[PDB]
């Protein structure tokens with residue numbers, strides 16, 4: 374689909390058997406999700422934002438269904454205020470910016 | 473144009489006589505630019521990011537040319553690491569997201 378921007382661009386995602394709502398974010402180089410129940414071996418990382426830098430756990434090869442479309446990649450779990458779908462998975466679902 | 477997201481979606485903007493480069497950010501409700509001399513008066517505002525908050529100066533009715541398209545709107549100035557075009561200006565240039 375085509376999404377206009379009068380409202381935040383939120384989509385329903387399925388990850389780890391759980392259902393969440395997440396923001397399509399062209400300004401995020403990576404994907405970061407609120408703290409959640411995920412299996413496996415993860416590793417520290419820190420990513421910067423507007424209000425400062427935050428501490429996160431990187432999980433690789435994580436399957437995500439975004440707007441019921443499949444993608445496999447790296448997901449970061451941490452204290453973000455919102456679930457964010459970043460460019461690393463937007464390219465995989467073939468998403469483009471158009472004006 | 474059609475912007476794919478393999479690299480950051482950067483664009484040339486003209487604001488207050490000066491040329492800068494800014495990020496098209498569907499994850500930002502508002503447009504926040506780096507400190508710069510902006511002709512005028514302003515009301516205070518604070519926005520939230522990934523690292524927490526920030527204190528910024530809000531200017532209204534500022535003309536901006538984004539990739540050659542003109543838009544008039546509210547612009548925030550302050551502590552951001554990158555100039556960001558947020559959804560208040562992305563809807564005025566006709567920008568949509570497609571997948």
Ligand SMILES: CC[C@H](NC(=O)C[C@H](O)[C@H](CC(C)C)NC(=O)[C@@H](NC(=O)[C@H](Cc1cccc2ccccc12)NC(C)=O)C(C)C)C(=O)N[C@@H](Cc1cccc2ccccc12)C(N)=O
Nearest residue numbers: 400401402420421422423454499500501519520521522553
């Ligand atoms: C800027 C306004 C704000 N939006 C936002 O902050 C969301 C916006 O897409 C931001 C822009 C970024 C460019 C500042 N995207 C990101 O922060 C992403 N960072 C990167 O991609 C960085 C960039 C980055 C690159 C290089 C150096 C950096 C140094 C410091 C910081 C970032 C840096 N790379 C990394 C690896 O760390 C995260 C998702 C990985 C917004 O709309 N705020 C609202 C709503 C709101 C409230 C509270 C928390 C929010 C969290 C996210 C989105 C919206 C949020 C408001 N009214 O205050």
